[PDB]
Design a protein that fits this description.
Layout (H helix, E strand, L loop, with lengths): L13 H8 L8 E11 L3 E9 L5 E9 L5 H12 L14 E3 L7 E5 L6 H6 L7 H20 L12 E3 L5 E3 L11 H6 L4 H16 L14 H6 L12 H10 L10 H14 L11
Antiparallel strand pairs: 1-2, 2-3, 3-5, 4-5, 6-7
Helix pairs in contact: 4-6, 4-9, 6-8
PDB class: transferase
Keywords: tyrosine kinase, transferase
Assembly: monomeric
Length: 288
């Protein structure tokens, strides 16, 4: 039976097993609400969970699991995805609470609960209807998380609004570190190589998603035609209501020459200046 699977930790790579050992969560401290699904995927599911802290306090968490495990490579990939967050510590980067390894069944990757889910769905909700200034603020928070990640020589590879989460204080947490063709830098589409400058390209697409309230980019351009479309110099167009200086920032992020793109440090400074000079309505705090 599927619930009797036993994972041989001896079969995982050396660096990986060492990292997992540092973040183990004892099973008696975790309650997974297996009947309260946060999100369902083909390979895994995310459930609400409750962790008991060292003083008996309850901590609301999200717990990811694999649906069916047949091979060690699947397990390795799943654990690598959780452990990647381990050594980062920044208000705009999602943290890892730990990994629970019961004698049988899938390992469980335990993350902080994000009340507002992913950024893309949040901005698409008419009942949220974020102001232009708060959308700029969310872009500033993402840039701050990416400036931190870049400083650690970390390349995300899959930066997009769907991969950023929002907590109960509207703090954006970059997550789901890396086919997302429409977010990829021209050079990545041609060489399959990724760098901090290709993350800058993707960041520009994420900013466009913010300013369009979650519109899909290049909806009419087939995925297999994107490279040529971009080589012809075409780019996503200025969204309605998007301030001119912010669109100039997006255009800079999509320069065909990686070396000409701004760094994330430069993007933080520029966006922060735009945020501070756009005097409009806003309800959230973005200056972590």
């Amino acid at each position: 039976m599927q619930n009797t699977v036993h994972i041989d930790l001896s079969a995982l790579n050396p660096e990986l097993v060492q990292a997992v050992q540092h973040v183990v969560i004892g099973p008696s401290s975790l309650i997974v609400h297996f009947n309260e699904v946060i999100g369902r995927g083909h390979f895994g599911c995310v459930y609400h969970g409750t962790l008991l802290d060292n003083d008996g306090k309850k901590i609301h968490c999200a717990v990811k699991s694999l649906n069916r495990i047949t091979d060690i490579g699947e397990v390795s990939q799943f654990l690598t995805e959780g452990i990647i967050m381990k050594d980062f510590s920044h208000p705009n980067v999602l943290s890892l609470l730990g990994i629970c390894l019961r004698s049988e069944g899938s390992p469980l990757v335990v993350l902080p609960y994000m009340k507002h889910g992913d950024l893309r769905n949040f901005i698409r909700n008419e009942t949220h209807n974020p102001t232009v200034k708060d959308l700029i603020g969310f872009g500033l928070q993402v840039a701050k998380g990416m400036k931190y990640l870049a400083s650690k020589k970390f390349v995300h590879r899959d930066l997009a609004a769907r991969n950023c989460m929002l907590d109960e204080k509207f703090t954006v947490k970059v997550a789901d570190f890396g086919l997302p063709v429409k977010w990829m830098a021209l050079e990545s589409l041609q060489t399959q190589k990724f760098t901090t400058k290709s993350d800058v390209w993707s960041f520009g697409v994420l900013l466009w998603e913010l300013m369009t309230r979650g519109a899909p980019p290049y909806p009419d351009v087939n995925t297999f035609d994107i490279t040529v479309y971009l080589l012809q110099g075409r780019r996503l167009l200025q969204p309605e209501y998007c301030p001119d200086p912010l669109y100039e920032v997006m255009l800079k992020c999509w320069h065909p020459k990686a070396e000409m793109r701004p760094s994330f440090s430069e993007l933080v400074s520029r966006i922060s200046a735009i945020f501070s000079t756009f005097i409009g309505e806003h309800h959230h705090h973005h200056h972590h």
